[PDB]
Swiss-Prot record, chain B:
CDD domains cross-referenced by the UniProt entry: BMC_PduT_repeat2
Annotated site (Gating residue): 41
Keywords, comma-separated and alphabetical: Bacterial microcompartment
Ubl conjugation as UniProt keyword: no
Name the record gives this protein: Bacterial microcompartment protein trimer-1
UniProt remark on domains: These proteins have 2 BMC domains which evolve independently of each other, giving the term pseudohexamer to the trimerized subunit. Although the homotrimer fills the approximate space of a BMC hexamer protein, the BMC-T trimers are more compact. Their universal presence in BMCs indicates their structural importance. The homohexamers form pores of at least 5 Angstroms in diameter.
């Protein structure tokens, strides 16, 4: 209920992400973060391969302050990657907690990234570039810390989103697979 | 699906080190031959596992298109399997990990580096001696490694173990043959 | 197997089993072979025969001090054959009461009692349990969280709460017990209210 894109009351559009290699220090990071600013900690999650993952939510000013305090003690270095999206896309909020496998769905891209921050930053950039739909997403858990997601829509939009992800990911991208029209035994449920 | 419709005795198994590359291989395998895609599942250690089912000619043709895409870049195929006529016991152990509750004896436990090594050796072992497949865990939860257990007569399970040895080659991590399990362990080997 | 096997105190009529023995093996098949030698050698109660993350096998057993010690000897003999598959090993003659309910499944606390807290992070499961038991019988602390290998690639962690002096006193003991097996040891003097009780979610 705290992952809702729309609150019933204060509005929290900003999304702060912290990916750490130490679970212990990862908790230390969370303390200092919520100390300097009243952000809303979305999750404190020990994940696959032993990494720790922090997600926070709040106003732009609140999140920004918590992230600065987080970085300073993160090297006092166990900080793997960071992400701050002042205005996260609405389709992205429901793909933060549990690994979502799509039920039923044309064209699709499959983005394979090295870190969790790379995935969330890539899906977001693509969701606000072309009218595409985020179908699946898995973050670190069960897949050795790696991350992947899928984006569906018209062919041209899928291609457009492919170049967007390819740019802001950089060396964090492992492979991007673009299929114009998958088989009927793939259309709908890509993972089973 | 994972049972034992036209008879589809052939089993194709693909271990791809990339989940993105994996879903591309699955699309290429089906567009060149009408196999039944049993599995498209990301497993532990960030690997991707593909399992297909069809006639020997269907699978054979699908795996050709698979190996073309799997090595298209700079390599992404960890291991592969192609069993024209897989044993009947081997089918209900492919979907999810199976733990035996109790036995009906000796036992052999095989630890393999890849999943393709496990299913291949289990297939070979089953066809050489009256052994019963009991447990099997593939990649998930154990960093990509795979294992299984076989039971039966002492001389029989040791005849099956020698077959596992050869079919695995360097993919064999460990083989254990317990002639007479302790009574508190007969059945539930994992708890 | 009786679900009450992890209970710190068995009912009246059941034998006393205060000792604890833990085995970490790099091989799962070898792990089964080792467990076989354990129960055959001595009548110890096998707590778990469990494969976990990083592909290692996890074994725990309980019984009288003389029994578990006898099973552990036969364990090390088999686990070390050829090239030893044994990664680490623990033997506690009288494991602390609080320690028992954390062995089986991962446990996350949902509340505290009024304030400091330490978070220990080890490389092996044995290093975690051994570090927890020593602290609990050194300082008046309370074990809140613990996770053994599963979901974190073989690593392990636990949390201890209490007064700042108590968690400090239970810090350098963990360091001496862990040795090189310790990764990171965090300490928090005054945790924020939002983190009090619920550290993992």
């Amino acid at each position: 209920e705290r992952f809702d894109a729309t609150p019933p009351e204060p509005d929290r559009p900003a999304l702060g992400v912290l990916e750490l290699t130490s679970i212990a220090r990862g908790i230390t990071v969370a303390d200092a973060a919520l100390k300097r600013a009243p952000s809303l900690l979305l999750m404190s999650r020990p994940v696959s391969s032993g990494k720790h993952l922090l997600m926070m939510r709040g106003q732009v000013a609140e999140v920004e302050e918590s992230m600065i305090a987080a970085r300073e003690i993160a090297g006092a270095g166990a900080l793997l990657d960071e992400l701050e999206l002042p205005y996260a896309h609405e389709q992205l909020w429901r793909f933060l907690d549990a690994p979502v496998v799509a039920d039923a769905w044309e064209s699709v891209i499959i983005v394979e990234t090295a870190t969790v921050c790379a995935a969330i930053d890539s899906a977001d950039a693509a969701l606000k570039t072309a009218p595409v739909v985020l179908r699946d997403m898995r973050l670190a858990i069960g897949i050795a810390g790696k991350a992947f997601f899928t984006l569906t829509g018209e062919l041209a939009d899928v291609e457009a989103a492919a170049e967007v992800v390819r740019e802001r990911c950089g060396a964090r991208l492992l492979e991007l697979a673009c299929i114009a029209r998958p088989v009927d035994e793939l259309r709908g449920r890509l993972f089973f």
